[PDB]
């Protein structure tokens, strides 16, 4: 597919200020 | 005897297109010979390294 | 491709009257899509 | 547009009439704009 | 880097036809109609 037809969202704010948080971004499918 | 015909056609085309192409670069050097600085800091767009 | 077409004929005699009608319609749609995406990254770290 | 109307009758006497009408109209319009802009600052 | 290309073609075709003939006097009337709607889209993005 042209997957970017269903654009990716902006990332989460990082889960924590320090010591390896994570952030994610789903598509607007 | 009598006859009538009417004929009509309408056709429309519209087209458009755009480009934006932006390139930026800022090589920075401290130390070494001023000629080497200027020669190397000068951005060879084909070889930015 | 879609087509719907009809033909009708009538004659009546008593006086004579006749009516004949033909009606036809064609509908077609075609859509073509293509897309390409490629991505890559390099890291190099040397000491 | 095309229209025809005529009469032809016998009676002795005979009378005939024919009228012919043709009309065409055509219109075309074309408009084009092209803009090309370059900015190059080096220092 | 990412390099992204999308191509899209859309076509629609429609026709209508009608003809009628009466006899009594005698008369005829007829009409034809044809249609198309068409769209092309191409969109691209490149980052480095």
Author numbering:
A (entry chain B): 22 to 50
B (entry chain C): 349 to 397
C (entry chain B): 395 to 408, 411 to 443
D (entry chain D): 194 to 204, 211 to 242
E (entry chain C): 200 to 223, 225 to 248
Kindly provide excerpts from the paper associated with this entry:
MAC assembles from the stepwise association of five complement proteins: C5b, C6, C7, C8, and C97. Though unable to bind soluble C8 or C9, CD59 directly engages both proteins within the nascent MAC to trap C5b8 and C5b9 assembly intermediates.
(C) A model for the C5b9-CD59 complex comprised of 3 C9 molecules. A comparison of the C5b8-CD59 and C5b9-CD59 structures reveals a common mechanism whereby CD59 captures the extending β-hairpins of C8α and prevents them from crossing the lipid bilayer. While the β-strands of TMH2 still deviate from their MAC trajectory, the angle is less pronounced in the C5b9-inhibited complexes. By contrast, the terminal C9 is in a transitory state for complexes with two or three molecules of C9. Indeed, a conformational landscape analysis of the C5b93-CD59 complex showed that for some particles, the MACPF of terminal C9 is not aligned with that of the preceding monomer and may represent the initial engagement with soluble C9. Together, our structural data support a model whereby CD59 indirectly blocks MAC polymerization by trapping a transitory state of C9 that prevents additional monomers from stably binding.
